[model samples]
Target: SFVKDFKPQALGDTNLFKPIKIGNNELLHRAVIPPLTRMRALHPGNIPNRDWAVEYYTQRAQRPGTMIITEGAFISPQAGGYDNAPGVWSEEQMVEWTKIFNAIHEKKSFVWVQLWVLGWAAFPDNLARDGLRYDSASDNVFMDAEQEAKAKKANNPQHSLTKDEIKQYIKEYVQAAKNSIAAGADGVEINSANGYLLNQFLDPHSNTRTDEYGGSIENRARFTLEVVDALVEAIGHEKVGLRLSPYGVFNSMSGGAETGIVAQYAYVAGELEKRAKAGKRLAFVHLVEPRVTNPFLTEGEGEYEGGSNDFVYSIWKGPVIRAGNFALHPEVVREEVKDKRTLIGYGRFFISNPDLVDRLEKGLPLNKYDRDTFYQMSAHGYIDYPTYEEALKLGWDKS
Candidate 1:
């Protein structure tokens, strides 16, 4: 396992284990369960399997007051590109999500839904199957050549979203936020990261329009800020969160230190802080570190050079959730959480260890996560990983 090279050290005298307030809820610890897409939802309706999702989330929320950010959920049919991923549009979907949220609450934990929309990053075949057109900030500026070829072959080649179309998307996001709150979610996290629709609009490399939606940093950030404002209006500001990967390169995105990514995102962070001063502070701002620029690559692989989220802290003075291979380097978690408003996010490690908060606090060994089963549509690796106490009682050998 990749973890063998590093020794596990107890988080000594660190603020990670300290309780803090984030969103509308107060967390018992600073370790958070960041969004991990397991694709366990059922297709056709893109509804999550209630039983499996309930158990899966409840398992991770065992430690009371823990915060769990759900996998990116589509806000509308047009926002979808992947099959077997959950959506928050229909009543059926909301019903299943309500059950999942109730299960998490049953464990006395809080959950926030991460609203997602895939533009060029979406699968053309999937969009075609739904009778939806492939879209992005600009026409034909697909993520990669293969994506463009597939979209052309599927007769759903990328098209630039018109002004009216953009308005409709904002409406969908507002309604999605309302639905999430009605379904018992503690808050909603606007996903403007990892080269999705909002991120595409924020990066000049993908968005190449001469209109008001592109050409400048302010214009590029307009769509994301508009979505945030709409969501804040629909739901209180305290119930809204934003996730940004200023230095990320995932999904063919052009963002890094060399690309002048800091200036682009600094404008965003400064705007958020300005809103905070105006008394409309968002629940938190989640930032992805530059260390793991490509989310697909696991720890110790595909490390990106240059760039750091430190600039964001200097601008957006609010609760921050930092996620990017923190499990590989616990020292970073120790050093960063000193801010008291920062929370460390764990993905794969949290998946393997249901009791991850306890393990991190005690410096216990982590179960080697099965990377193969991560995106599978099965419960084999999703709900089967035992807790440390369960492993001991079952006489399970070191995993």
Candidate 2:
């Protein structure tokens, strides 16, 4: 095994390979898996494919003490954004999901379920074909050039959630957390980032509501805080984490990319910090660095250092997990943890290399995966990716 026991410094630290405690879960090292939406759950059935899903998770967990965040799974069928994506709503799904989690646990890794619900991004076909309703923070629909031409259509029209619906959604989130834990997950991470359901409320461009859930930052943050409160009440805060992207413009959202993004997210961070300090601390706060996730993103505004994470590090209370292909270097990971209690996460690298940690330890090259098979429902592009040893057997060293 390439992993060694962690060493702690007496005062400040600069150890990326150090073991540290975060909430109820104790991390072995800072290398953690960030969520990726791999549309491969439906195999030979509508629910999660137990055989392949278990094998997929088990392969990653082969790295002892690895920290794995399971790919984002839909909270409900109505919350559908992609057709082949997995869901935890059905009874059968719990059985399959439980198998998936237990397989990861059996291999010795800290695993959590990344629960998601897409609001405006919910595909139009999903709503009309299945008698579901498409909604977002406001009445304005997220349409591209081709989509805008087909506006006023009944199919997938943007329907803003009413006050009552918002309340219902909160209840659903709590239930989803309970479901995840019941299926044997160590924790649950709310998809508040990446222009998901909660983010639509956070972004000023998407939220046009005049109700208490809109207007000021405080009002805009109501939905997130409510969900956090409900989650803590249902499954305890020690097992809850929140993921956010302050500057990401993905899915046509406006945060730092649009309105007073810093102010909006900073306010939410402060609110979360206060709650976390009040005996209801979250397991971790997952974040995306603008300059890291998108290489072309600017370094910083005037005096503030880094980027969006600087705001998070200043306001957030506990463990911070950040990812970008840019921050995977050993020096960068050590630098980040030394600056503030944070973990380094990898998505593309982690997905392609099942033995990623070992490859990092051995200084070996990683295998690149094709994105074409990403949207397809098959194993040729998924679990088919070989581990480091398997690649070596297939002639990696000779090359």
For every model shown, what is its TM-score relative to the native structure?
A: 0.97, 0.89
Minimal lDDT window, size 10, model 2:
1-10
lDDT of 1: 0.88
CA lDDT, every model vs. true structure: 0.88, 0.74
- Candidate 2 structure quality by residue, lDDT tens digits, 287-325: 876644342333232212335567677788688888765
How well is each residue in 1-399 modelled by candidate 1, as lDDT tens digits? 224556777884589878899877999888899988889888889998765899999999999999999999999999998998899999999999999999899999999999999998899989998899898999846688889788878988788999899999999999999999998999999999999999999988888988999989899999999999999888999999999988788887886643667899999999999999999999999988887888778686766666668888889999999998898678877788878788989987888889888878788777888989888978889999988877776655553
Segments of candidate 2 deviating more than 4 angstroms: 1-14, 43-46, 141-143, 146-154, 255-259, 292-306, 327-330, 397-399
